[PDB]
């Protein structure tokens, strides 16, 4: 799948999930390299540090 699954995910409470895309990368100059990389885009919930610092 083009994204990671959240079918059995329990929410964090201090970090918010935004996007979890995955991509398959190849190196044109190597030809023996391959990997799958997932970007975890996470958004902080700022109330705690707002209250405690700002």
């Amino acid at each position, epitope marked *: 799948s083009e994204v990671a699954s959240l079918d059995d995910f329990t*929410p964090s409470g201090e970090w918010d999930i935004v996007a979890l895309p995955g991509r398959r990368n190849e190196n044109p100059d190597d030809s023996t390299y391959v990997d799958i990389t997932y970007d975890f885009i996470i958004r902080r919930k700022p109330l705690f540090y707002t209250i405690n610092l700002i």
Partner: antibody, heavy 118, light 113 residues
Framework: VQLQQSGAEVMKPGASVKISCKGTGYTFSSYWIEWVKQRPGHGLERIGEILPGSGSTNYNEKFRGKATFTADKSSKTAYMQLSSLTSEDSAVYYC????????????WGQGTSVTVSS | DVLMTQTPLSLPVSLGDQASISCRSSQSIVHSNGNTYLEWYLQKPGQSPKLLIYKVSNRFSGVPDRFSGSGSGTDFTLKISRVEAEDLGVYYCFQGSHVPWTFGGGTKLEIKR
């Protein structure tokens, strides 16, 4: 992939609505569902979005309190709840699939028509 | 919320004429990663909106090549080179950069004769 919305609805002012968008053919839990309102006059207005995988939800300024989103993990469907209804809410509501900062709104629902009158 | 403004509210242009739609934002909508997330949609009457362009420099798959976008942090423009009857509808801006994401005001397109 297919996004399936509920059928049209007619109800009196002051009632509450619960329209649903059901998606199939992709990882439902990992996409933001964007709810868009289109008054018959003109203009597309975005009510908010929900991420079925978690409870995350965002509402536009004009719709806070007016609308409320909910999702079911087991059944690939998400619900929008409308608070005390009025004649101004008479419009057609859309559901779309969105992944922020990457490919965007490539699939939409058919559209649900909600009309309010006595 | 970021406010997106589209002009002109109408653009009657005969077939084969270049059509340009302007889009302006209350704030800059450039993102930290180096990209700016602006999307263009087309809603024909009686149909749901259709995606046309995203990350304006880019373009969606399946749409014809006559479409193209460009712009800086606050000013963006969509361009249609050679119009037809299948390009009739309402074009909307959509900024995906700053939460909450908001739509443009829309701009009806007509053909002048």
């Amino acid at each position: 992939v297919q996004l399936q919305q509920s059928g049209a609805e007619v109800m009196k002012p002051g009632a509450s609505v619960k329209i649903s968008c059901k998606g199939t053919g992709y990882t439902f839990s990992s996409y933001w569902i964007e709810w868009v309102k289109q008054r018959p006059g003109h203009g597309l207005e975005r009510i908010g979005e929900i991420l079925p995988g978690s409870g995350s939800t965002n509402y536009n300024e004009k719709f806070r309190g007016k609308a409320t989103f909910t999702a079911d993990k087991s059944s690939k469907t998400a619900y929008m709840q409308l608070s005390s209804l009025t004649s101004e809410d008479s419009a057609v509501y859309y559901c779309a699939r969105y992944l922020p900062y990457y490919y965007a709104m490539d699939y939409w629902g058919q559209g649900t028509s909600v009309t309010v009158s006595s | 919320d970021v406010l997106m403004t589209q002009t002109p509210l109408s653009l009657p242009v005969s077939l084969g004429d270049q059509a340009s739609i302007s889009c302006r934002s209350s704030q800059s909508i450039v993102h930290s990663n180096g990209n700016t997330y602006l999307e263009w949609y087309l809603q024909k009457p009686g149909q749901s909106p259709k995606l046309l362009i995203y990350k304006v420099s880019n373009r969606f798959s399946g749409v014809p090549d006559r479409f193209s976008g460009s712009g800086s942090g606050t000013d963006f423009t969509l361009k249609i080179s050679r119009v037809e009857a299948e390009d009739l509808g309402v074009y909307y801006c959509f900024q995906g950069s700053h939460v909450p994401w908001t739509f443009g005001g829309g701009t009806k397109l007509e053909i002048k004769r």
